[PDB]
Subunit: 316 residues, 4 copies
């Protein structure tokens, strides 16, 4: 089969090429966005492979189908940029990667948390230019503090495993407690208790109507002064405006956000400069092993479709 | 008593002041180094408090004694900068902080490791200026890799507890294996096995004659290509010249060093990260250092026995 | 007419839009490179507007022609990426911008030079994080030193006007000396005198066979220790390998290079030397981007009306 | 003689050492501030050498005299930190460096201006990590624009010579028109005309009562949108609060400030969010200008030691 890959970054290319050694697809890599105008560049391909900024609205899907495309493979878990009803009407198959390597994501969240804690991002800015002053870099010992994890799916549990290794007291919130978390000694609590008791908070939950702007003024109001917050889940779990205010106020001691590529809204520049704030550009799954799993699943998804096999990751 | 504090940083001042609420010493804070020339500034103080760059050689200690100083308190574990024989001969007491909060230090080492792994230091340099490109930032999943910890004192064990939590296989080397490590499932091995098997290596051992330049060309020779190395122990455990060559060579994938408080105190070219002896720099760990320091001095003042007395 | 613009940056778009207020073309902006695969995106346009990385080799031009494109407008002076013989054979017109605003380019070069001299790039890295240490930032007073300019076209003369304002002794080398330079008090000299007498050197000349690798080991050998070199002209005027060696050697005190897109063949010498790269930024001013857009749209307007276009390459 | 140097930075040490090769003083370098508590460190020296943050109030001078000091040398032009009456009463001599190389200062101002114009400081941040994007880096061609220089002393004239070289239309304000400026073609105007006509404005004037907060809300109000402003003179010529507000509302396009050691975050936010550049009192920081300062300083002290007359004696 022939596959056109849109929004291609060098790391996308590297792992798709590597994995394709087991599949033998003809791969065509485009660095630009799939849009209604660029969809004609998929001519001669049975499949396209897209990511979060690509446009999968109806007019694009119509243009793909006119050019003979049959299959759309999201190299990601999110699918809000694809009109699935239109895809279904047009006869197009849509597949996705059901979830990222949960350990890669959790380990990114701990990496953000420790970089923020010990100001290692600031330290490097100093030491790369041979300034070894430690003023302002003082952090906190994690051992013995309380961590709150919101969401105990596979990612959140991977996070809790790590936090346990740091010797922290483990609190969680989730509507549905997970057995794996309870073996780690995690105490499920309600959100108000999690807010009020947690030295560090990390979000590992899907965005739903119920938890949209879950971290808002009232939430921050209840947190400890100097609380550390990391969000590697969707940006909308947090009310930006309330966060900035709580930063200025000094309720939030540190904030780390892995900012999704279609959620970016110089708030970034100011907050990064003036506060212990760290943005990363949707980097939580960016490891060799996790990018390999994404590629594997993507090309295995397409292989299924081509052979008429059942594809567990089919959205339509 | 009155205490002159040399080489004072704002964080030193903050925790000494906080802790001094339990002691009531009169504190005099100087931001400059103790040297033979500045020793005279301590006149009227019974005690000085110094750190790793302050000069405690004989001629400085002679000056301190002439100006009435009786006690020297190192707000640190190392004491290489103080001439203990000269101190003893002059009748000066020297006290120190026996060890740092081992969790603070291990936590810094894991911080360095994850910062290097995920290139978060490089990410921030982009994103503070709203560049969200991820090119060049790819890391590795730690889960299921092998970590090698060299030295299993309290710090090394603290490190192993954290590495366990990441789901890593745990190897260690130490002449004298520790019971606490064994409970974590650590497998003690010899240095060659540690080098060859480890995805990440972290040093948590004192500098001795025998392990001076422990990580040299022959060591790097045996390591995996792309190995990650973090050194929060003394810089001399590593042969700099061999490290640089193994970096250029691409044997070493990433190198983090918490460079001693003046041990020559690069970052441009490779995945290399220096921090300026920052491994004990947390509120809790600085509080313990100040507590112990002022308690050490309180002991001396009252003639009590001081477990942290060097002389 | 309808114009498809490839490799579009925001600044490209801004000035094309502004200028197009006088022309009324229908503009279609693409942020991606023109290649054989993307050429089909130009279908419905009589013209494409490209820059230095876009592919104008024969296969791409064949595809443009099949999609009804007649005109190719380079928003730049270089045309190395376009197969002009193939264009001519296929009947496609190629137009370009003959030169950039010479003052924009000279002014960039002096900017590089003073940024390097006073280490203002390094100062900002410190002061943006409230570090006001000045260690390592010491420069030199320009007044009374000697500047050497290689190439006295419009850009080099613009540069010499500026350097005159700094109160420098002005030397220049060009195979055709310019009368315009003499007013400024410039002394034309041979290369060996320029190399040996100059505290700062700046290149402002086209790349020719004669001056390919003009700054090589033998050149550096003759220069003062600590010499400052700025190159806003083509990268091949300099033998890279000899420059790096002369940097490590400490013959060259500072090096600035405005590195062209297709000459991009950084971290270590940026790190460990007073070296500064900019990304082919010398024409990046509002006025100069305006001129490029004016000329581009005027070039296309000529072609559409059958008028003679002075900037036609074929 | 033996000389104790306070507030010593690396470059102070380098040039004093260099220049001292022809004087042979015994030099003692201290990196810390002279205060009443550290004055005792000068014991055994006949002279101290101080800079702008060192404390020369009476209680310090009393302590210096008690320790055998006779001479105080300021390696700078300002002497606000020294009590000259008390020095005179105690019998201490005070010398200074009468002015800095005006070209070094003007050149730093132009360096600031062009760095800001072409965003070269932002460029370098990108390119040192191989990012060659030019988005946001667009500047303006200087040729044919209008420059306003406020103050036409030696520094200001040095600046006008450079700006003439850029082919700019030259406006100035100064109570006293300078001949040297007029021969450059400068048109003297009043401040309101300068503000309204100038694309770039550079301050080169001493701080006086009448020009304290000279650049305030009313000034900014009258300037062109996107104006570029550079201040290598004293910080108080500008009303910081009004400048920030004019930055946010986008009246000021770029702002450069060379920030004095005794006049220092607002720094971080503005540096991040706007085309703002601070330098740390770097305007005299060249080899030539630091050499002159050290020469004059050691020559001042040599004069004193030999009883000669010292043109730079304050006391
Ligand atoms: Mg010498």
């Amino acid at each position: 089969m022939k596959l056109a890959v849109y929004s291609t970054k060098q790391y996308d290319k590297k792992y798709l090429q590597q994995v394709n050694e087991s599949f033998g697809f003809e791969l065509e890599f485009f660095d630009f966005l799939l849009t209604e105008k660029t969809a004609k560049t998929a001519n001669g391909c049975e499949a396209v492979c897209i990511f979060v900024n690509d446009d999968g609205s109806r007019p694009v899907l119509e243009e793909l189908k006119k050019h003979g495309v049959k299959y759309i493979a999201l190299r990601c878990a999110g699918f809000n940029n694809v009109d699935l009803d239109a895809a279904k009407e047009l006869g197009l198959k849509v597949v996705r990667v059901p979830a990222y390597d949960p350990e890669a994501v959790a380990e990114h969240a701990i990496g953000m948390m420790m970089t923020l804690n010990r100001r290692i991002h600031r330290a490097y800015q100093r030491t790369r230019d041979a300034n070894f002053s430690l003023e302002g870099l003082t952090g906190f010992t994690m051992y013995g503090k309380t961590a709150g994890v919101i969401g105990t799916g596979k990612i959140g549990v991977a996070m809790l495993r790590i936090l346990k290794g740091f010797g922290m007291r483990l609190l969680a919130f989730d509507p549905y407690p997970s057995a794996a978390a309870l073996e780690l000694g995690v105490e499920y609590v309600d959100l108000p208790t999690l807010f009020s008791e947690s030295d560090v908070i990390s979000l590992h939950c899907p965005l739903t109507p119920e938890n949209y702007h879950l971290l808002n003024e009232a939430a921050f109001d209840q947190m400890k002064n100097g609380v550390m917050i990391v969000n590697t889940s969707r940006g909308a779990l947090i009310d930006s405006q309330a966060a900035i205010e709580a930063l200025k106020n000094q309720k939030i001691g540190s904030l780390g956000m892995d900012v999704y590529e279609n959620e970016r809204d110089d708030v970034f520049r100011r907050l990064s400069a003036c506060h212990n704030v760290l943005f990363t550009g949707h980097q939580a799954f960016l490891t060799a092993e996790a990018l390999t799993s994404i590629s594997q699943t993507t090309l295995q998804n397409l292989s299924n479709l081509e052979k008429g096999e059942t594809c567990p990751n089919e959205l339509v």
